Design a binder for this molecule. Structure first.
Ligand SMILES: [K+]
Ligand SMILES: [K+]
Ligand SMILES: [K+]
Ligand SMILES: [K+]
Ligand SMILES: [Mg+2]
Ligand SMILES: [Mg+2]
Ligand SMILES: [Mg+2]
Ligand SMILES: [Mg+2]
Ligand SMILES: [Mg+2]
Ligand SMILES: [Mg+2]
Ligand SMILES: [Mg+2]
Ligand SMILES: [Mg+2]
Ligand SMILES: [Mg+2]
Ligand SMILES: [Mg+2]
Ligand SMILES: [Mg+2]
Ligand SMILES: [Mg+2]
Ligand SMILES: [Mg+2]
Ligand SMILES: [Mg+2]
Ligand SMILES: [Mg+2]
Ligand SMILES: [Mg+2]
Ligand SMILES: [Mg+2]
Ligand SMILES: [Mg+2]
Ligand SMILES: [Mg+2]
Ligand SMILES: [Mg+2]
Ligand SMILES: [Mg+2]
Ligand SMILES: [Mg+2]
Ligand SMILES: [Mg+2]
Ligand SMILES: [Mg+2]
Ligand SMILES: [Mg+2]
Ligand SMILES: [Mg+2]
Ligand SMILES: [Mg+2]
Ligand SMILES: [Mg+2]
Ligand SMILES: [Mg+2]
Ligand SMILES: [Mg+2]
Ligand SMILES: [Mg+2]
Ligand SMILES: [Mg+2]
Ligand SMILES: [Mg+2]
Ligand SMILES: [Mg+2]
Ligand SMILES: [Mg+2]
Ligand SMILES: [Mg+2]
Lengths: 343, 328, 81, 208, 132
RNA sequence: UCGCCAGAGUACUACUCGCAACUGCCUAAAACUCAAAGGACUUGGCGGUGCUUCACAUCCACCUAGAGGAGCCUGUUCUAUAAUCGAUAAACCCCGAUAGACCUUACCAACCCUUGCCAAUUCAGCCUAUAUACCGCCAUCUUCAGCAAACCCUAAAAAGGAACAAUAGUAAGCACAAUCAUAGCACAUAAAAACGUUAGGUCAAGGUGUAGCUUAUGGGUUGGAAAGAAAUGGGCUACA
RNA sequence: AAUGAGACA
């Protein structure tokens, strides 16, 4: 029955059954990963159960200048050699069950907040080791096809940043999740924004914007209290470099709109120097802990206007009801003042 | 890949020297045709694909034409149309259009001076001139083209060629001209043969539907045909079969002016009758003037019949008929 | 850009793409063009043949002088040391 | 089809080539036939330049053939023309002075004339409209009328003939019957005219 | 769809050698026969014995050289001597190759009662014809 | 500035006030049930939707020879016997079989054998169950032209990506194409035909996952699987 | 030309 035997690749290609019709449209819900074991991982050409020492294969051909001859092995010696092989195989099994504990994202199973390392180098040889990327949203996308039917595709939305004020985002979609990450990282560095940071810890002024159907409001904060924002905003803020911010999200909480709305609002930020130039007047910062000391932070380069600003007795500004309610001390929710973990 | 080509060139010359040394010929005249017959002998590869046989030729002819480097060390492109995607095609278009303006400008000056010294040389019908094929043109510009681009380029040449032609322009145009082979349907008239005091006898070959006929016609005898040593009337009882033999002779009005002996083997009665008919038509071309030979072709006498019995496909009752198809 | 519009009266793709690649553009803009993305717009006429020829010649001498005066200073630099 | 699109139908008539100088346009037709170097198909076995053949006879001979017996079909057609000739010769002898130069003794003339009287003038084709079929008369083309006349001749002599009477003699009788406008085939032709005339108001259904 | 001795297309990351890259209908058109002998001629006998011996060598050479075999063997039968041509990767030390060469030549000669020739050509890795 | 809106179904309903209404109008809940209901959009399929164009064995018009009727041969279903299995819309039905008197043979009835083919083995052996675990080898849409990977674009991207007097796409891989075979070419026929669809067919070519048997679902000997009430498919010979 | 789908994501 020697002719009845087959090749190792043929046997494993059939035993695994990873090419049939079961694994096409989710028909196979086994959920247990069948593992293929290479039976040639441990090989000693010449070694056998009977224990024959063939000169040339296992034992050296020449011993002390004399060529060895064919010889057998002692029963006790052969037992020890066989005991060595089985322990090696048991060790291999122990090194396969264990799995590397990946970085903990926003949760234990989602990919939100998981870093993928530095982006791939550009075609010109430029290397980006300072940039870091984070995953914001992974979602399976299905499409209806004439032949296959449900064509499952994976799209991801990642953001990159160096921590010095430059960051960007992009979306990458492919048939495989592994290929999806690669496309998202490379296309991210092509779209980069520069977000001005007042003293490299906070935005210059409070920002209120409405991107499509997403209402996001951000407020300036001192150095002590920082990074109290949406868990997706915190991921972007750490990449940009902002370390003190408060943000409240109202309306739709879609990840794509929130990311676009945040960058659009931050890219529209106005600095003190620009405000001084367009007004031709000095801007004075009144620190509360420094008393009534008039610290000057920016000066209008060029002509200085001698005409003071017209003082309006009652300013005409649009106030948000949430801001006034909190200021007067009427927000008594059981979630606003809760103690949380570190930033 | 310039260096790789250079390495192939030098070792091919060295390899040619070794082949000449082992073949025992003169290495100075070891031509490519000699190399092909030498390789076909040392390595007798039996394969039906003509391109799959072992080859050893000039690396320039083997390796496809490669694009040269388009920019210097500083990155500046050498040509001024490199940013158009297809520099070679558009440069040719730019030069071709520029020649048209120069011809128009030159013709305008000639009209001002009241002189017309140019003539239309587009008509090259006796030579058999045809424009470049798209595949041939792509191998001249070393760049891929499209059907829309090819048609535009050819039509532009027609405008250039329809204008008065200059000496420089014709040299430019003639690079885009190709000559077709000689086209003719005249047959080769076999000269008459004389043998052992026999005058005006010719031999013809005919074959139709697995039946080969050998007919030799004597121009000095009366009207009779001897097939396989027996009279044609006995050998062809069917009226239709004997009508086939009449068809060549009757068309030439020489039914009784030729004595023939025939030898036909294989096939049925009609296959032999058709084969003998074809052989006589080819054999009688020697005795007939050239003008009526053309008339012979127009009647279908000289054209062999390509209709042969087809095979039987596996899974079918016959050559085309299939088994009964029960829908349910 | 001697003409910022294509043959279908739409803004040229190169105008938008150049801004993406951060490439400054000097283009002649007609009365129906969009000078928003062009960093050095030149409001003028791009249809009459005399206008088009004038712009080409002006950029011919501007380039030639730049090429020549680059060479003249290089010659002076070579004899400096 | 082993013949490509370039191949054309050969010309067989010898007289077409022997007198070309009396016309100019026809000269341009065949001088360019070979000047264009167009290939010519092989001569068919059935057709020949013999002056004693006739195209209508070959088509009629082919239809009578069953299976692949061309010799038997040719033999039957030969006897049928002979059978008609014998009957016409016999009737000529037993005739008066004025009757002698009335009878036609040419079987080819009789055969050509017989078919030209059995051809229907207007045919019928079913048309589906409103879930029902209406027999709508149509002006059948010449080739269809010529083909239909031959089929009626073959169908009549094959079906309602006696077992003893031979095929060549039975067909000979019908040719004479059709030559006098009194054969059953002529009756069948009139019957098709009866149905076509009755449905004369349904001709508006057809759209061609 | 035909599946006899074919490798299916899977993106462009799986290398294929020349033998495996051609469908079986290309035999005698693009690639020759891996074995040549007189048994399958027109009027020659002794065809079944050659076939079974051929199959055994396909299984013996594959197991004698585990992993280091590149592709299929080539078997040539001249007179009564048997020639085996193989492509072997650079896996075993040259001492082991000569040991196996001597072991194979002697064992097969005394089993089929005919002289055996074993010629080896060594390549750095499997030769790739398409994809990759 | 006024009116109206607090998940869906129950509900333009029950009860209540007013009304020339009396099967009515207006006002308008709850018990209970569900974890959704609902707006817009994208691709695909489909349409007894419209417009234009087209079927060279093809749908109609139309050509020739046949099946369905009878005998016989053979294959299924049903009937029958103690007495296989598998195929069984197109893609089953002279099919696995280019092949069964014993053998083959896997079926039945009896009668024997328990390291029971091999060098060894607390192991050999299984035509035992699972084609819904599979490799192999195919059917099929199909002589349909589209599939897949790299990359770019879209005031966002579910997805889509062409205008030649060109308006966002690019170059390669597979398939078609070309080439090769049928001893000239041509034509024609063969051969080819990707990614997928039908959990299509095949544990009974063979191998093998999982489950089962182990003095028995294993091995051997002898004898025997009859029979056609009836129905049907594909064929041969005819009805001259 | 009326009807049909169950334990496929
Ligand atoms: K659609
Ligand atoms: K039948
Ligand atoms: K038995
Ligand atoms: K099994
Ligand atoms: Mg399968
Ligand atoms: Mg967890
Ligand atoms: Mg939500
Ligand atoms: Mg037939
Ligand atoms: Mg204008
Ligand atoms: Mg609300
Ligand atoms: Mg409710
Ligand atoms: Mg109502
Ligand atoms: Mg009511
Ligand atoms: Mg109430
Ligand atoms: Mg049909
Ligand atoms: Mg019959
Ligand atoms: Mg019957
Ligand atoms: Mg029957
Ligand atoms: Mg059965
Ligand atoms: Mg069954
Ligand atoms: Mg059993
Ligand atoms: Mg299946
Ligand atoms: Mg949109
Ligand atoms: Mg592509
Ligand atoms: Mg192509
Ligand atoms: Mg050929
Ligand atoms: Mg062909
Ligand atoms: Mg085929
Ligand atoms: Mg092909
Ligand atoms: Mg199934
Ligand atoms: Mg089915
Ligand atoms: Mg089944
Ligand atoms: Mg088994
Ligand atoms: Mg079974
Ligand atoms: Mg098993
Ligand atoms: Mg038993
Ligand atoms: Mg019946
Ligand atoms: Mg059949
Ligand atoms: Mg008989
Ligand atoms: Mg019902």
């Amino acid at each position: 029955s020697f002719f009845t035997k087959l090749t190792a690749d043929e046997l494993w290609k059939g035993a695994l059954a990873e090419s049939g019709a079961g694994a096409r449209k989710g028909r196979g819900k086994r959920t247990k990963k069948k593992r293929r074991k290479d039976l040639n991982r441990g090989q000693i050409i010449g070694e056998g159960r009977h224990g024959f020492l063939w000169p040339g294969l296992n034992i050296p051909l020449m011993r002390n200048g004399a060529v060895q001859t064919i010889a057998q092995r002692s029963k006790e010696d052969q037992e020890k050699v066989e005991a060595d092989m089985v322990q090696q195989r048991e060790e291999w099994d122990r090194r396969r069950k264990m799995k590397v504990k990946r970085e903990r994202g926003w949760s234990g199973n989602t990919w939100g907040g998981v870093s993928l390392g530095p982006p791939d180098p550009g075609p010109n040889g430029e290397t980006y080791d300072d940039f870091d990327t984070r995953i914001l949203e992974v979602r399976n996308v299905f499409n209806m096809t004439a032949k296959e039917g449900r064509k499952r595709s994976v799209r991801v939305l990642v953001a990159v940043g160096n921590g010095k004020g430059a960051a960007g985002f992009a979306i990458g979609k492919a048939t495989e999740r592994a290929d999806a990450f690669r496309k998202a990282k490379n296309r991210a560095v092509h779209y980069l924004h520069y977000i001005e940071r007042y003293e490299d810890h906070t935005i210059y002024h409070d920002i209120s914007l409405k991107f499509k159907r997403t209402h996001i409001k951000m407020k300036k904060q001192p150095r002590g209290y920082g990074l109290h924002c949406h868990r997706a905003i915190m991921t972007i803020c750490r990449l940009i470099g902002i370390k003190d911010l408060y943000a409240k999200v109202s309306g739709s909480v879609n990840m794509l709109n929130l990311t676009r709305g945040l960058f659009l609002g931050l890219s529209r930020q106005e600095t003190h120097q620009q405000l001084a130039d367009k007004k031709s007047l000095h801007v004075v910062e009144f620190r509360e802990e420094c008393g009534p000391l008039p610290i000057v932070v920016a000066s209008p380069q060029g002509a200085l206007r001698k005409d003071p600003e017209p003082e309006d007795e009652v300013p005409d500004i649009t106030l948000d009801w949430e801001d006034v309610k909190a200021a007067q001390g009427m927000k008594r929710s059981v979630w606003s003042g809760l103690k949380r973990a570190a930033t | 890949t310039v260096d790789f080509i250079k390495k192939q060139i030098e070792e091919f010359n060295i390899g040619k020297r070794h082949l000449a040394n082992m073949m025992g010929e003169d290495p100075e005249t070891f031509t490519q045709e000699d190399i092909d017959r030498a390789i076909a002998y040392l390595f007798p590869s039996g394969l039906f694909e003509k391109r799959a046989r072992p080859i050893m030729k000039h690396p320039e002819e083997i390796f496809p034409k490669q694009r040269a480097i388009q920019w210097g060390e500083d990155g500046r492109p050498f040509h001024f149309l490199f940013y158009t995607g297809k520099q070679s095609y558009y440069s040719l278009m730019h030069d071709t259009y520029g020649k048209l303006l120069d011809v128009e400008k030159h013709h305008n000056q000639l009209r001002a001076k009241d002189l017309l010294a140019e003539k239309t040389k587009i008509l090259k019908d006796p030579i058999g001139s045809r424009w470049l094929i798209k595949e041939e043109l792509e191998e001249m510009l070393v760049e891929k083209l499209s059907d829309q681009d090819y048609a535009q380029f050819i039509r532009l040449l027609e405008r250039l060629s329809a204008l008065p032609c200059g000496a420089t322009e014709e040299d430019f145009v003639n690079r885009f001209r190709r000559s077709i082979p000689i086209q003719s349907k005249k047959q080769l008239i076999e000269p008459l043969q004389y043998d052992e005091q026999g005058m005006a006898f010719s031999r013809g070959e005919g074959k139709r539907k697995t039946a080969k006929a050998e007919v030799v016609v004597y121009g000095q005898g009366s009207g009779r045909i001897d097939v396989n040593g027996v009279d044609y009337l006995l050998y062809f009882p069917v009226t239709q079969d004997r009508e086939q033999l009449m068809f060549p002779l009757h068309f030439l009005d020489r039914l009784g002016k030729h004595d023939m002996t025939c030898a036909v083997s294989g096939g049925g009665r009609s296959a032999q009758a058709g084969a003998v008919r074809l052989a006589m038509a080819r054999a009688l071309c020697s005795f007939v003037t050239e003008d009526e030979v053309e008339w012979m072709r127009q009647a279908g006498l000289l054209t062999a019949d390509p209709r042969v019995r087809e095979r039987k496909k596996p899974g079918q009752e016959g050559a085309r008929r299939k088994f009964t198809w029960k829908k349910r | 850009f001697l003409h910022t519009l294509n043959n279908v009266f739409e803004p040229h793709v190169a105008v938008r793409d150049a801004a993406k690649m951060n490439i400054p553009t000097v283009g002649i803009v007609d009365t129906n063009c969009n000078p928003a993305l062009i960093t050095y717009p030149v409001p003028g006429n791009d249809d009459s043949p005399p206008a088009v020829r004038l712009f080409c010649r002006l950029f011919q001498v501007a380039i030639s002088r730049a090429k020549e005066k680059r060479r003249q200073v290089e010659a002076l630099y070579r004899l400096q040391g | 089809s082993r013949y490509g699109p370039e191949y054309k139908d050969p010309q067989i008539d010898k007289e077409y080539y022997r007198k070309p100088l009396a016309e100019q346009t026809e000269e341009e037709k065949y001088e360019r036939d070979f000047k264009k170097t167009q290939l010519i198909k092989a001569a068919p076995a059935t057709k020949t330049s013999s002056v004693f053949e006739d195209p209508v006879i070959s088509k009629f001979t082919n239809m009578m053939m069953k299976g692949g017996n061309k010799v038997l079909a040719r033999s039957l057609m030969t006897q049928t023309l002979e059978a008609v000739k014998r009957k016409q010769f016999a009737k000529y002898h037993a005739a008066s002075a004025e009757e002698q130069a009335t009878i036609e003794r040419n079987p080819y003339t009789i055969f050509h004339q017989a078919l030209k009287n059995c051809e229907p003038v207007i045919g019928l084709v079913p048309i589906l409209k409103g879930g029902h079929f209406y027999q709508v008369p149509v002006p059948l083309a010449d080739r269809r009328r010529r083909f239909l006349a031959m089929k009626w001749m073959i169908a009549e002599c094959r079906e309602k003939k006696h077992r003893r009477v031979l095929m060549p003699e039975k067909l000979s009788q019908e040719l004479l019957e059709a030559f006098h406008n009194q054969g059953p085939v002529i009756k069948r032709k009139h019957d098709m005219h009866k149905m076509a005339e009755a449905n004369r108001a349904l001709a508006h259904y057809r759209w061609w | 769809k035909n599946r006899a001795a074919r490798v299916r297309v899977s993106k462009g990351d799986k290398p294929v050698t020349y033998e495996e890259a051609h469908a079986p209908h290309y035999i005698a058109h693009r690639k020759g026969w891996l074995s040549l002998h007189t048994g399958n001629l027109d009027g020659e006998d002794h065809a079944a014995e050659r076939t079974v011996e051929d199959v055994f060598l396909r299984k013996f050479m594959l197991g004698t050289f585990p992993g280091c075999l590149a592709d299929q063997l080539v078997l040539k039968r001249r007179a009564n001597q048997l020639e085996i041509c193989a492509l072997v990767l650079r896996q075993l030390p040259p001492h082991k190759f000569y040991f196996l060469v001597g072991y194979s030549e002697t064992l097969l000669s005394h089993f089929y009662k005919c002289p055996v020739h074993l010629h080896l050509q060594t390549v750095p890795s499997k030769v790739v014809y398409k994809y990759i």
